[PDB]
Design a protein around this ligand. Structure first.
Ligand SMILES: O=[P-]([O-])[O-]
Ligand SMILES: [Cl-]
Ligand SMILES: [Cl-]
Ligand SMILES: [Cl-]
Ligand SMILES: [N+]
Length: 427
C-alpha cells in the first residue's frame, strides 16, 4: 500500500539488528530508523550516516510508533515501556531470527536449542555436515547472526537459537528441530520458567508430517508432545542413549573415541540421532567426530617409574586445557612447553598454583610464563629430555608427573614423551 515509504524500525542495535539492517539496506526499499537506549560509538554513527539511516540514541521515543514493522533485539524485555506502547498502537513486532526463517529455504535449516551444550552441539552439527562436503553456514545467538548467510547460497544453515530469539519470533518455522535439553537452572532468562519452556518449544508445534523433531525425552516431563505432527525421535530411550564409553543409536552400539563428560556425551548423542535420521549411517559421523576440535583429549596414564606416576596430556594446547588436566589431582609435577598463545598468564598461574608441586618449562612458552611464576618452585630447561629428567629429580615416590604443554607446536610430543618414558624403564 505504501511502496517505498515503508518505515522499518530497529529497537536496540546489537549484532542481530546490525546484521539485519545491513541485509535490508541492500534488499529493500524503505526508510530505516534505529533506536538505541545507550550511546552509539563513532564508527556506528558514521556507518548510519553513510547510508542515511536515521537514528536516535539515549532513549526510545515515540518516533518508533511511526514504523510499519519494528525488529526487536533479542535481549529487549517484554514488559518494557516501548514494547507496551508499540503493541498498544498495533505496530507489528518481529526479530532478526524470524526474518531469517521467513526468507531462507526451510528444508535447509537445522535449528538447535537447549539450556546446556548448545554451542558445542551446534558446532558439531556444522562440523559433520561440512565434512560430508556440504557448504554449510554456522551461526545464531552465540555467533554470526543468521541473516549474514542470506548473501549467496548454502546447502545447510545450522543455527543455535536462544529462548530470547524464539520469544520475539512470532512463528519460527523449522523443518529440522533439535532440542538438546531444557533445564531449570542456571538461566540467562528474565523470569518465568513456563515462558522459557514455551519459547524454546515453539518450532515443534509448527511442524508438519514431512518435518523432523529430535529431542531429549526428559522434556516430556514438561510438555505434552503427542500432538506434534513431524517424525519425532526422542533420545535417552531404550534405543538411543550413551554411557561413558558407548553410543547406542537405533539399538546399535558404537565405541566412542574417548570417555567424555556428560554434556559432551549428550551433544554427541543428540547430533547422532539426527545424522542417522538424515543419512541412515553413523560410520561417517564417527570418523568426522574424531577431528572435531572441542572434543576432549585423552589423558593417557603411562605407568610408573620408581614410584612416580606419569600422565600424558600431550594435546593440551592452551592455558584452559592445562587447567582441565590439573583438576584431576592435588599435587603434580607439571611440564609445559610449546608456543604460547597471546594471553595473560597471571589468571592462569594463580588458578594453577595450588596444584603445582613444581613447574617445568621449555620452548617459547617459558618466556611468557617466567614473569608470573616467581611464586612457585619452577625450572626452565631446553627440551623434553631435560624436562623428563628434571621431573624425576624434583619428584619422589608417590608423585604425579604430568605433561600438559599449554602451547602449540611448530601425539608428536606425546609420542616423544612416551618414548622417553620407555627408554628410562617405564613399565
Ligand atoms: O527500556 P524502555 O522501553 O523504558
Ligand atoms: Cl537499546
Ligand atoms: Cl543494544
Ligand atoms: Cl541469529
Ligand atoms: N540486546
Amino acid at each position: 500500500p505504501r511502496g517505498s515509504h515503508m518505515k522499518i524500525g530497529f529497537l536496540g542495535f546489537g549484532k542481530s539488528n546490525r546484521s539485519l539492517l545491513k541485509y535490508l539496506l541492500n534488499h529493500q526499499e524503505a526508510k530505516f530508523f534505529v533506536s538505541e537506549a545507550k550511546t552509539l560509538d563513532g564508527e556506528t554513527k558514521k556507518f548510519l550516516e553513510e547510508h542515511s539511516v536515521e537514528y536516535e540514541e539515549g532513549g526510545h521515543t515515540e518516533k518508533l510508533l511511526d514504523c510499519d514493522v519494528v525488529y526487536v533485539s533479542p535481549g529487549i524485555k517484554p514488559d518494557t515501556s516501548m514494547i507496551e506502547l508499540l503493541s498498544s498502537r498495533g505496530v507489528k513486532l518481529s526479530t532478526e531470527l524470524q526474518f531469517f526463517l521467513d526468507n531462507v529455504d526451510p528444508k535447509k535449516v537445522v535449528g538447535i536449542t537447549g539450556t546446556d551444550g548448545k554451542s558445542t552441539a551446534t558446532a558439531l552439527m556444522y562440523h559433520v555436515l561440512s565434512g560430508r562436503g556440504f557448504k554449510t553456514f554456522l551461526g545464531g545467538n552465540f555467533g554470526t547472526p543468521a541473516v549474514e548467510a542470506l548473501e549467496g547460497e548454502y546447502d545447510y544453515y545450522v543455527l543455535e537459537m536462544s529462548s530470547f530469539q524464539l520469544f520475539w519470533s512470532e512463528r519460527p518455522y523449522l523443518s529440522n528441530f533439535l532440542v538438546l535439553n531444557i533445564s531449570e537452572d542456571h538461566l540467562d532468562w528474565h523470569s518465568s520458567f513456563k515462558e522459557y519452556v514455551d519459547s524454546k518449544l515453539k518450532p515443534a508445534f509448527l511442524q508438519t508430517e514431512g518435518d523432523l523433531f529430535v529431542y531429549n525425552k526428559h522434556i516430556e516431563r514438561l510438555r505434552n508432545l503427542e500432538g506434534v505432527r513431524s517424525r519425532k525421535i526422542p533420545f535417552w530411550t531404550d534405543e538411543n542413549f550413551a554411557t561413558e564409553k558407548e553410543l547406542i543409536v537405533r539399538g546399535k552400539k558404537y565405541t566412542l573415541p574417548g570417555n567424555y563428560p556428560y554434556q559432551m556425551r549428550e551433544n554427541i548423542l543428540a547430533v547422532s540421532v539426527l545424522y542417522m535420521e538424515m543419512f541412515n549411517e553413523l560410520e561417517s559421523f564417527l570418523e568426522l567426530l574424531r577431528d572435531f576440535k572441542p572434543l576432549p583429549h585423552r589423558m593417557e596414564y603411562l605407568g610408573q617409574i620408581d614410584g612416580r606416576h606419569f600422565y600424558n596430556d600431550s594435546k593440551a594446547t592452551s592455558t584452559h586445557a592445562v587447567l582441565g588436566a590439573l583438576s584431576n589431582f592435588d599435587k603434580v609435577v607439571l611440564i609445559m612447553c610449546g608456543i604460547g598463545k597471546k594471553e595473560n598468564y597471571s589468571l592462569f598461574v594463580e588458578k594453577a598454583s595450588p596444584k603445582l608441586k613444581h613447574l617445568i618449562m621449555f620452548g617459547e612458552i617459558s618466556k611468557e610464563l617466567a614473569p608470573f611464576v616467581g611464586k612457585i618452585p619452577h625450572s626452565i630447561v631446553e627440551n623434553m629430555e631435560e624436562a623428563f629428567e628434571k621431573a624425576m629429580e624434583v619428584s619422589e615416590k608417590g608423585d604425579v608427573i604430568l605433561l600438559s604443554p599449554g602451547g602449540a607446536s611448530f601425539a608428536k610430543r606425546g609420542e616423544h614423551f612416551r618414548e622417553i618414558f620407555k627408554r628410562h624403564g617405564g613399565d
